Design a binder for this molecule. Sequence first.
Ligand SMILES: Nc1nc2c(ncn2[C@@H]2O[C@H](COP(=O)(O)OP(=O)(O)NP(=O)(O)O)[C@@H](O)[C@H]2O)c(=O)[nH]1
Ligand SMILES: [Mg+2]
Length: 162
Amino acid sequence: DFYDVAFKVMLVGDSGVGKTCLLVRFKDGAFLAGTFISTVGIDFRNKVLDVDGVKVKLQMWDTAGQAYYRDAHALLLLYDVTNKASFDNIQAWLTEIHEYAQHDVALMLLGNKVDSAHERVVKREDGEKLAKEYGLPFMETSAKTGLNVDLAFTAIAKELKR
Ligand SMILES: Nc1nc2c(ncn2[C@@H]2O[C@H](COP(=O)(O)OP(=O)(O)NP(=O)(O)O)[C@@H](O)[C@H]2O)c(=O)[nH]1
Ligand SMILES: [Mg+2]
């Protein structure tokens, strides 16, 4: 698959929030309810998307939640709607990104695991409100059901293209 433009996008957030699964879902269209394998170092995978008749390659970087920043064009920040601590830690992740990433990085906040599996503890409203407070786009997602996964990557690609 060829493309018109390419961007580097990195996923960040607490360990366990769903960074690896979210990427597997977008890239492979599947959710493997497999072994929880905590990511140790960063690694990348490519995917090409159509945006306004333009083909956009995303070079997507997974990262460990338990100098890269300065190279990224965009960062997806995830928390887990069923883990209040992951949401409480979002501002710290934002401070880090603001401190170490290019000043012109695109950002997006994702409240992941919005599905039957576990009980929500963070209301969508509270995530909407945090996003509004820092100017970031926001979406709820699920690697398990596929909720808004394609649409989140499409939106960031769209913002980068424009
Ligand atoms: N129900 C549900 N489980 C999910 C979802 N996303 C991930 N999981 C599960 O939650 C756990 C953590 O997922 P994972 O993708 O490994 O998270 P991570 O953010 O990559 N962790 P780390 O930073 O440690 O590498 C796994 O057991 C995975 O199957 C989701 O949307 N829904
Ligand atoms: Mg991982």
